[PDB]
Write a protein that binds this DNA or RNA. Structure first.
Length: 70
DNA sequence: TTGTGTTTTATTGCCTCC
DNA sequence: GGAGGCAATAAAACACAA
């Protein structure tokens, strides 16, 4: 049935932290993180892709706001 | 509630690396 | 010799007003 799982607040936290460590995850790290977090490598891949899109989207907006002063 | 918007998983399909 | 990137999209989930 399921169309999307919801990730636990723990799982998200680790992933955000790691994302701050580096925007692109290494093959080795990916494998560590998946194993310690109880998700698949694919899910971690994908999550990292989404987070970079979110970041691009937030950055464009930061820019749009900064164009809007003086 | 219901409608209305934004966020979060997950896929698809195309591109680029020698 | 196939991984890894992005964009565009879908739908569940949330948030919350009216």
């Amino acid at each position: 049935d399921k169309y999307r799982v919801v990730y636990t607040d723990h799982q998200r936290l680790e992933l955000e932290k790691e994302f701050h460590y580096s925007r692109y995850i290494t093959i080795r790290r990916k494998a560590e993180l998946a194993a310690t977090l109880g998700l698949s490598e694919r899910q971690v891949k994908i999550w990292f892709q989404n987070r970079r899109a979110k970041e691009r989207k937030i950055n464009k907006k930061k820019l749009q706001q900064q164009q809007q002063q003086q």
